[PDB]
């Protein structure tokens, strides 16, 4: 039950990161008339994702188990990583006035997607 505790802790940290990024995106949207709506939607999406990650972390904390549950979990993380990649790409397109910050945020999101995919894989290896 060691890395599962560790995995859940990493997931809690990532949820916090996603909340901070959602706030950042709202602030950017205040100063971008041409994409504000889109950015606000994305921030909402991110806040919802943070909630799901918190839920998942909770579940991991309890199971730390059954190869069944863990399998179902690492599946969800792969889907969330895909969603984050899509968000990173839309932020990339939006970036193309103050869009350097948007590029950096998308980069953070793609790295978070990578960390999530790796966590899914370490889960499946645990399973």
Contacts (Cβ under 8 Å, ≥6 apart) of 86 = none
The values of phi and psi at residue 98, to 5°, are -65, 85
Q: At what angle do helices 2-30 and 36-63 cross, to 10 degrees?
A: 170
Decide if 83 contacts 42 (C-beta within 8 A). no
Q: Domain range holding 25?
A: 2-126
Q: What is the number of domains present in the chain? A: 1
Decide if 93 contacts 79 (C-beta within 8 A). no
Q: Measured between alpha carbons, how far is 121 from 77 in angstroms, rounded to an integer?
A: 10
CB count within 10 Å of CB 96 equals 7
Experiment used for this model: X-ray
Q: Measured between alpha carbons, how far is 68 from 59 in angstroms, rounded to an integer?
A: 13
Q: What are the distances in angstroms from CA 97 to CA 15, 83, 100, 103?
A: 28, 25, 9, 12
Resolution (A): 2.0
């Amino acid at each position: 039950h060691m890395q599962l505790e560790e995995i859940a802790q990493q997931l809690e940290e990532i949820a916090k990161q996603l909340k901070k990024i959602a706030w950042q995106l709202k602030k950017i949207a205040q100063g971008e008339p041409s994409a504000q709506g889109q950015l606000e939607e994305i921030a909402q999406q991110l806040e919802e994702i943070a909630k799901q990650l918190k839920k998942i972390a909770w579940q991991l904390k309890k199971i730390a188990p059954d190869s069944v549950q863990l399998e179902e979990i690492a599946q969800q993380l792969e889907e969330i990583a895909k969603q984050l990649k899509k968000i990173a790409w839309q932020l990339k397109k939006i970036a193309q006035t103050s869009g350097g910050q948007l590029e950096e945020i998308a980069q953070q999101l793609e790295e978070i997607a990578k960390q999530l995919k790796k966590i899914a894989w370490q889960l499946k290896k645990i399973a």
